[PDB]
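Q: Hi! New to this. If I give you a protein sequence and the SMILES for chloride ion, can you show me the bound structure?
A: Yes, paste them in.
Q: Okay, here:
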Amino acid sequence: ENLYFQGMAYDLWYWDGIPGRGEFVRLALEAGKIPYRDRAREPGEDMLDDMRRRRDTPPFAPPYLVADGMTIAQTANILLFLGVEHGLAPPDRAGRLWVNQLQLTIADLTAEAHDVHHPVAAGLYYEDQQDVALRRAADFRETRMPKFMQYFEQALDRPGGWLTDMGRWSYADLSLYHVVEGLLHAFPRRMRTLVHRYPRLMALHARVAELPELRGYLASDRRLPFGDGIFRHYPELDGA
Amino acid sequence: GRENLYFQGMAYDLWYWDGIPGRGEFVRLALEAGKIPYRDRAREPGEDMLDDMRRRRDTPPFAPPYLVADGMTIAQTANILLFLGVEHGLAPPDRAGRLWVNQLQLTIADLTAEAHDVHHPVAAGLYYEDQQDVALRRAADFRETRMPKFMQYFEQALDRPGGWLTDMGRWSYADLSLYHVVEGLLHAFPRRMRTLVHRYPRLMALHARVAELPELRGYLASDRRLPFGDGIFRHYPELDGA
Ligand SMILES: [Cl-]
Ligand SMILES: [Cl-]
Ligand SMILES: [Cl-]
Ligand SMILES: [Cl-]
Ligand SMILES: [Cl-]
Ligand SMILES: [Cl-]
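A: Thanks. Here is the predicted structure of the protein with chloride ion bound:
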């Protein structure tokens, strides 16, 4: 590597090994063609030591992005920055606030997808909370997934095939693609039932998958598969 | 004259559930302290929020609260507050300061959701009584690991001169939110807070400082400030502990 334009590179800090929350940021950086370093994936990485450093603006948890001497944490907050700085969101306030709330709603769904298998405690193993997971999964499948998906289906009721009227994808379109990917992995049977209800959502999902901007990244070693992150396939939690 | 007047159509419309302070309280504190005219529409006789939300078609809210302001319908508590911070100076004027306040608010929102999920760990739509056994388990973790982690975080975020979360030289909306989440925890987990509060002198100083703001005096003593009950912050003795 070591080519000139990488002097502008942002530092992204998020766990190696799973897509996780970091994936929402990474999708925007890749599609936006914004130079960055995936610091925790580098051989001599020390995210432990980096995150405990004295900062004026300390991250509570990953992901965080270091840009212009700023340390920016919270997935939606990092993307808000990229939206304004790199044009991944509308130019006007109304548009940016719309994209921000969409991203926050996507983050809500994403958290629910994690909490389905960790309903008692993020810090306890799934195995010790499986009985609770079975109960929470029934609600998540029966009420939560349709509610969120109907909402995004209605958000997409506009000319041009994106979440906004900006005439191109926003970072929220990328994030919506990703949460659908996550749900397809974690709940394949339930999605099989539900996808027919949401043709605009599934057209959006398909359209992002085929973006020229993302072709390279999605086929690359930088795109990690799902596993034991947010979106986990436990067949006992799935259902028609 | 003393009283700030406004003509028809000037007030923002805040739409949030009546009965509980809930998520709407974070917005209400900022509008009140910032002296931004607003109507708490869902509390007014004859108004129907569920009806109002149905018609909201260009930028529909997923759920309350939402704010109808300056031609926009703005939803998500942190998003509503982001607008107020930028347009009414309730957050720093600079980019880095705004991003800092926004992440602090989102972190406050994480803690707030966890305070709700302690008693609704299975489903927001099901009654507490039907998921009480699960709640006991979730509560043990929330008290033991989560509450101190968030509180320590805010204690460190406050380690700067000036007695606020930012370097702007005054309270921001995240400072008001931080006061409110501490009020909520004091109500819901009084025994655990008895153990914890001594650890966080800057946080408790912040809490007391906001409580005393002359711009909040009227509001906090008014009928407009609803007490906690069966909203987000709920006092269940069985979920509390040292
Ligand atoms: Cl994941
Ligand atoms: Cl269990
Ligand atoms: Cl409440
Ligand atoms: Cl609307
Ligand atoms: Cl139970
Ligand atoms: Cl102690």
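A: Chain B has two domains: 1-92+213-242, 93-212. Let me know if you'd like me to explain how to read the tokens.
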